Design a binder for this molecule. Structure first.
Ligand SMILES: COc1ccc(Cl)cc1CC(=O)Nc1cncc2ccccc12
Ligand SMILES: COc1ccc(Cl)cc1CC(=O)Nc1cncc2ccccc12
Lengths: 304, 304
């Protein structure tokens, strides 16, 4: 028992982390096969970060300008291209440590592990979620650009996020591995509206199933609700509306505890309207929405 | 900015994880050099776990009885010994993936990363702390025994914890890598008093310095206190008494924010007496004690 904000093991992703320097700017790159993926803002100095013309800035650069270092060894760049907001630097060597990998675009509300990196060297791994408004609440500093978010299905690493920007609001913005920004963000030094964020209702419900599994049952009540009534409450408390698909996804956790999904919604409804009353659920004094139903089943079952 | 419950990267420790079978019991082992360290309860069946005579149970076992598997390859055990509550299985091969390592006994209140493992295969990594009462609040299931806690100083891995027992209270007990149990625990299936746990005051203060660094300043007040007055409050709220050594350790975070350590104690004193009032500090509705001052400086500076 016990419930931790567990991240996937980062070894497979550490073997791919390289440093990419371009001019005075240094950041992280991801080396898989004979290619190094990194944010395109590596070609920018501080002045032109206000409104950069990346097509124009990339034209004054040639393969010899992209200094890629895999730890201490220099990688020979034999090709370069811009795909959306990432630069693809083809290197003459394929990463001997390339794991089985996929590039996937996750849905808002999905979770992943992030391996923070500075100068192509890792510092830590933390589990986090893609907010409903496509931002991430990461822990990132200058030079963490190029740090990736990922998932691991047994041996395959599904790379879902490359880190790019820190919004003036302290939250982070990034892209999928094809250079597509999650959310409305652009790679410019301009204040950007992240939009209204909500609470991922299905994940909160999943975390309530993980509490019952792990002994915390105080919030369980003798009530039930409908999806209609629940959503009236969920809108007021700025929670994502619960759909029938969410209920079906919660099927396995509902079968493990024997607590119907609308019965769990009644517990959530009461907690939303009354608060925790100074009590904690899984050592937390707030409703946690960063554990999807798959994470709860995986952690409470033991998927390696 | 941002503050995450960040764990150290687990790659160096993944390369050491092996499966150890002995009879019907399978658990995890740590392969460093030509030795595999694992909990001694691997030699127990379910019946004799009530009160086992480990010296007697180890006598009916020989090197060929310890099935050690490094992924898919079988390791040849050429020697075995019991050191306190761990078994040291000498294997004819030295782990090609052995990192620079140390075996250290951490102080209560110190933090470390845990790589949970089932059948010598890792599943996740989470950051946690050694409670003042020598227990850990981990996320562990059956077969997670042998999962290790560790710290990483640039390239050296300081192994501090081997996981052994789950107390009936849902909290976890384990040993240092010399087989010495942290706390009063024994490796028997008997209910064990974990003792009164307190809040690690220095870590809460450190987390308050990490909040000010990351923008959360609502809890800052126009008051100050003395160590004497603070400790009167700390005892009532079951917090560890703050010593002059704790204050000196908080020196760097106090110099970074310009907020005296007794000025931060006044903020903590007021939060302890008034609660959070429905507000959050670093996305938490409770005072967090699982980040030491070294972790806060490391995360807010970027130590790789
Ligand atoms: C003005 O810098 C821009 C503008 C636009 C873009 Cl696309 C990228 C950057 C670089 C960036 O935001 N880096 C950082 C990402 N995370 C955290 C950071 C913490 C401190 C400083 C920079 C941090
Ligand atoms: C009765 O089992 C004993 C007694 C004494 C000792 Cl020394 C070791 C064990 C094995 C053990 O506690 N394993 C587990 C460690 N963490 C979490 C566990 C969750 C579920 C089941 C076992 C879990």
């Amino acid at each position: 028992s016990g419930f931790r904000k567990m991240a996937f093991p980062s070894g497979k992703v550490e073997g791919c982390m390289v440093q990419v320097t371009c001019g005075t700017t240094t950041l992280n790159g991801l080396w898989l096969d004979d290619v190094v993926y990194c944010p395109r803002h590596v070609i920018c100095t501080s002045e032109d970060m206000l409104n950069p013309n990346y097509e124009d800035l990339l034209i004054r650069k040639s393969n010899h300008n992209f200094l890629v270092q895999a730890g201490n060894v220099q990688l020979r760049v034999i090709g370069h291209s811009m795909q959306n907001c990432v630069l693809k630097l083809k290197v003459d060597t394929a990463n001997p440590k390339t794991p089985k990998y996929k590039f996937v675009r996750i849905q808002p509300g999905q979770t992943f592990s992030v391996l923070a990196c500075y100068n192509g060297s890792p510092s830590g791994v933390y589990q986090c979620a893609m907010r409903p408004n496509f931002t991430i609440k990461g822990s990132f500093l200058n030079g963490s650009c190029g740090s990736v978010g990922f998932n691991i299905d047994y041996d395959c690493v599904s790379f879902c996020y490359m880190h790019h920007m820190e919004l003036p609001t302290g939250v982070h913005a990034g892209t999928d591995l094809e250079g597509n920004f999650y959310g409305p963000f652009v790679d410019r030094q301009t204040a950007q509206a992240a939009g209204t964020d909500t609470t991922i209702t299905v994940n909160v419900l999943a975390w309530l199933y993980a509490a019952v599994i792990n002994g915390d049952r105080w919030f369980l009540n003798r009530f039930t609700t409908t999806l209609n009534d629940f959503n009236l409450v969920a809108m007021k408390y700025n929670y994502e509306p619960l759909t029938q698909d969410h209920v079906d996804i919660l099927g396995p956790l509902s079968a493990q505890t024997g607590i119907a999904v609308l019965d769990m919604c009644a517990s959530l409804k009461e907690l939303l309207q009354n608060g925790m009353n100074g009590r904690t659920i899984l050592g937390s004094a707030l409703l946690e929405d960063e554990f999807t139903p798959f994470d709860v089943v995986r952690q409470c079952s033991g998927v390696t």
